[PDB]
Amino acid sequence: EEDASQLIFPKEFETAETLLNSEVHMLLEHRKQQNESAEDEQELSEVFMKTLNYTARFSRFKNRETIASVRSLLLQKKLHKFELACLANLCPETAEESKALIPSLEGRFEDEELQQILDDIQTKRSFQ
Amino acid sequence: MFYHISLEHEILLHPRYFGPNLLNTVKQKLFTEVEGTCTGKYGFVIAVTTIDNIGAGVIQPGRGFVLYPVKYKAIVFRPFKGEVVDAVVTQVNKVGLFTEIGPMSCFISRHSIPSEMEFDPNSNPPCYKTMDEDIVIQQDDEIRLKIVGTRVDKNDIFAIGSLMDDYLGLV
Amino acid sequence: DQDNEIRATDLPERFQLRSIPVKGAEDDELEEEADWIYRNAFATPTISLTIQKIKEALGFMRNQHFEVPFIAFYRKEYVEPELHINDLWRVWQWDEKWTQLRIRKENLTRLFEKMQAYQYEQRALDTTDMERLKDVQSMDELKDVYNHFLLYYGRDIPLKQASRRDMYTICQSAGLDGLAKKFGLTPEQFGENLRDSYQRHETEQFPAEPLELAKDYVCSQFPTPEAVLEGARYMVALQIAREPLVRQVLRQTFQERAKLNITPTKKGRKDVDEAHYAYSFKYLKNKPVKELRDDQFLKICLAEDEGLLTTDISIDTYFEEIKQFYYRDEFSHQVQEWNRQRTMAIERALQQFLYVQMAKELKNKLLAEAKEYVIKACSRKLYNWLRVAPYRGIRVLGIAFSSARDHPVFCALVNGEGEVTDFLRLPEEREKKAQDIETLKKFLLNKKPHVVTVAGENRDAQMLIEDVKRIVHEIGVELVDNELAILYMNSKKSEAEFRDYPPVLRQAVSLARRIQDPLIEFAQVCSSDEDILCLKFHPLQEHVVKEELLNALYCEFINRVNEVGVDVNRAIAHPYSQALIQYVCGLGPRKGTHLLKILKQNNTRLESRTQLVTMCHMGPKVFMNCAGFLKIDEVLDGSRVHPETYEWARKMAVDALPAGALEEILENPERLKDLDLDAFAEELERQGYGDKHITLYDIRAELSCRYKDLRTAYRSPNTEEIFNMLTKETPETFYIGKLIICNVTGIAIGVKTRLDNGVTGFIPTKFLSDKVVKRPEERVKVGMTVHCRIMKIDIEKFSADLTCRTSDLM
RNA sequence: AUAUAUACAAAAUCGAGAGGA
What we know:
part of a larger assembly, 3 chains, A: mainly alpha, 6 helices, 57% helix, C: alpha/beta, 6-stranded mixed beta sheet, 5-stranded mixed beta sheet, 16 strands, 9% strand, flat, RNA-binding, transcription
C-alpha cells in the first residue's frame, strides 16, 4: 500500500521528520561520543553499528553547517520532506537522473530549474 | 529511509527504584527497552533522542509496581516500496546479490539483476559481470537499487531490490 | 545428469570438478604460465613463515591429464628432485589462478579494444593497451589497470550510466582537466619519478599563478576561484592515485616498510587479560609487518572482528620523500604557489586514496598468508595421522570408556579383516573390579587378541592399561588416541553399522579399527566435509576458508592413499574399506562408486588390472591415471609398477637370470645389483624413450617386495603424547604461570589439588611451610576449590606446582 | 590409592435423605 514512487505513505510518516544520511551520521557519532564516555553503559547494538557504518559510507556532507545549508536550501522550495531527503542523499547529477530516482518529482518543477537546484546541492557538497 | 518520530511507552517500575534518582531509572529503562529493537510499523529503531513527558505514575493496586507512561522521540529507518537507496553488496550468489541498506538486508534476485550481467563464480572475487566486464558488481561495491518489496520476519525488515530502471546499480 | 557424463568421460574425476575446466596448453602459454607459477608460488611472503620442472608438470596436468599423484609417483624424473607431491599440488592450485588471470586479462583486452574503436570513431590508448594489459602479472595490478581505465573511459558505455560517487566527473564536467593538465607533470610521469626515486621528469612551470588559471575555469559548480583549485587538486589526486605505476611503487613501499599499530577498544581493555589470546598484542606500536609470525595476524584480525581492538597499517615519512619530486626549485613566488598546490595534491592522493587502499590490500595479503599457515598446519597434522603404519592381519581388542562414574567399559575384538568379532561389557568395589579383571582374562585367554588398545579419555586410561598389562603378562597393550572414535560414535554411520550396540562400543570398534590401519579408518569416518572438519586440526581451523581447508585435507588423503594404494578386492568383500577408492588418483566419488558398482554387479573380483578397462569401461586416461594405484594381491598387479612398465619389469626379471624367473625373483632377489641403471637407461633412449632411470630404480625396489608399505612404523606415544592426549590440552595450553581453578583434595605433607584437567596439583611445601609443622588448614580449608598459578609441571607424572601467594597471582 | 539412586499430584457427577447453627 505504501509506495515511495507514487508518493504514498501510511499516516504515521506524515508528521515524521526526515533526515539526510549525513544528519544521521553526525548524530550517530554524537551517540558514539555519549557511549564511549559515560562508562557502565551498554555498548551500542550491532544494528547501531551497521547503520553507523552505512551512513558513514554514504554521508555526502561531512560538515554540520553544510548539511544545514543543504537542508535549508531544500526547504525554501516547495518540496516534500521525502524528496528533500532523497535528493540530498542520492545527490543526483542530472535532472533526468533525479526523475529516474525520484519519480515523485514527476512534472513538479522544470528540468532546468531543477538542474540549478541540483547544482546548488553539488556546489555545497563538501570535500572529504 | 531515516526519520525522526515520536512514540509511546509505559514502564513498570519495581519499588526498589522508588527513591531519589527514580526518574533517571525511568529513563534508563526506556533506553534499555525500546532501543535496539525493530518493529514493522516503524522499521529499524536506531536510537531514542529525547523523551518528552513522564506521566503520573500510578501504583498498580496489589503488586506494587508503578506504571509510568512516557512520551518520547526516536530515530527510525523505514524503507518504502519504490524507493531507491544506495546499498553495499556483501556477498554474491548465483541467485542474486545480498546487499544491506544500512541495518536492513536486501536481496536482488538474479532476475532482478539486468540481463547483460552474468554471475561468474570462477572469478577470484566472485562477481556479476558483463562479458567484456564494462560493468562489474562484486563484494563491497556500492550500488543503487529500487526497493521493490519489503517483508517482515521476526520484527526484522528485509527488502527486495531491483536494478531494472535507469541509473541504478554499480556506483 | 552431470554425474552421468562425469562418470562417463575419459578424464579424471577431480578434473571435472574444478571450476575453471582444464584446457590444453600451447607450450608458449605453458612457458609463460610456468614462469608465473614460479614467481608467485615461490617468492618470499610478507610474514615470517626449476621453472622447467613446473613446465613439465603443467604439461602433464593440462595436456595429458595426469593427476598430481601420477605425476608424483610415475613421472618423478621429470619433476624430481625439485617438485614433491605437495609442490605439484601447489602447482595445480596455481594453474587455476593463472587461468583466471588469463581470462580476465582477455576480457579487459576486448573492453579496451572496443573503447579504442569508439575513440577512433569520435586521452587515448596507444601502448597502455599493450604495455599495461599484456604486462599484468597479477590480479592486483589488473585492477589497477582496470580501475585506471574506468576513471578515464568509464564514463562512456557505448540503461543509464548510474552516476559515480567520487565526484571526479563533476569536475570533469567543468573542464577541470584544464587545470590538471596545467599542474606540471602528467601522472604517468610522476609515477615514473617515484619509480626511480628521483626527478626523472622535470615539471612544467607556467606564466601565471594558480588563481589566474582558476578564473578561467571558475564557473558554476565552482564559483570562488579557490573552489576550482580544490576541484583541480582533487582531479589531480585521483589521477595520481589511479595511475598504475604509482600503484606499483606504492604497493611495494607498503610491502616493505609497513608498520602495524594496535590499541584496544573500550570492549578490549577490559576483557583482554593474560589468558585471552590477544594478550600479547593488545597494544602494538610500529610492529613491522615483516615480523608477523605464522598465524599471528589471523588472530589480530579476528580480535578486531570481535571489536575488541583496533588496528591500522601505515609506514610511519613517505610523504616527505615523495613531495620532493613533483616540485620545482626557484623561489619565484609564483612557483611556491604551484609547488604548494602540487604538494597538497599529493597529500590528498596519498592520504585519502593510496594509503587507505594499500592498507586494505596489505591486510588482505597478510591475513590470507596467515590463513594459509593455518591450513598448512591442519594439513600437517592430518599428514601425521595418516602417516602411521599398521601395527605389528591382526586381531585387535579395543577398550573404550567414559567418565566411568556409574558407566561401564566395553571392549571389542576386531578381526584382522577389520570386522568386529565379539564384544564384552566390563562393568565392596575391590571385589567388583576383581571380577571384571577375571572375566577379562577369560576373554583374552579365549580369543587371543594381538593388541589391546585403550582409549585415551583421561587419567583412567592409565589405570586401565596397567590392569590390562597386569593381566596379559600372565602380546601387547597400548594406549590409543580417542578423537576419531568419538566422531565415529556420534556419527549416523555408526548407528548404521551397529544398530544394537551402545555408543561406547562404537568407540571400541573404531579404536580397534584405527589401530589396525589408520588411513582406512580416517577415510571411513571422515566421509563428508562436515565430518572431517569436526576433528580438531588447529585451534583456528574454524576461521580459514572452508573450501581451501577441505582442499588441503583431501589432498593429504589423496597423497597417502595413493602411496598406500588400495586393494579393490578387499574393498569389495569387506565393504568397510570402500571409502578409500575415492582418493585413488584417477578416480573420484562418482567414478569410484561406479567402479565398485560394476564389480558388484558382475559378481567378480578384479583378477587383474587390465581387467579394469577390460571388464569395466574405463577409458585410457583414467586407467593410466589410476591403474598404478590398485593393488590386487598376473603377479605384477600387486605391485606399484604401472601396467605401462610391465614389459620393462619383465625384462629386468630376465636380466636377473619367465614365470620361474619372476617367482624366483619374488622368492628372493638373486642379485639386486644384477642391474645396471645406466645400461637400462641407455637402452631406454631407444626402448621406452626417456631418462627413466629412477623408474627403473623403483621397479627394482618393487620387485623386492610387492607394495612395500611406506608408512612409518607405529610407535607408542611419547609421554608428551600421553600427556596432551589424556589431558587433552597442548604444550601451549599449559602456560606455565597460567591461572587455573583447581579443587583441593587432601594432604597426602602437601596440598593435593585436583585440576579439572584431570591433573594433580601439588602446592609445594615451601608455600605450604609445614612438613613436620602443623597441617596447613589455617591457610585453607580442605574440600573447596581455589584458583592459583602454575609454576612447574611434571608431565611424566601429571603433577603441577601451584601458587598460594597473591604476589604470584599478580 | 577409593565413594550407587530423582518419578509426579492422586479422589467424579447427579439426586435423595438425614442432620447442625
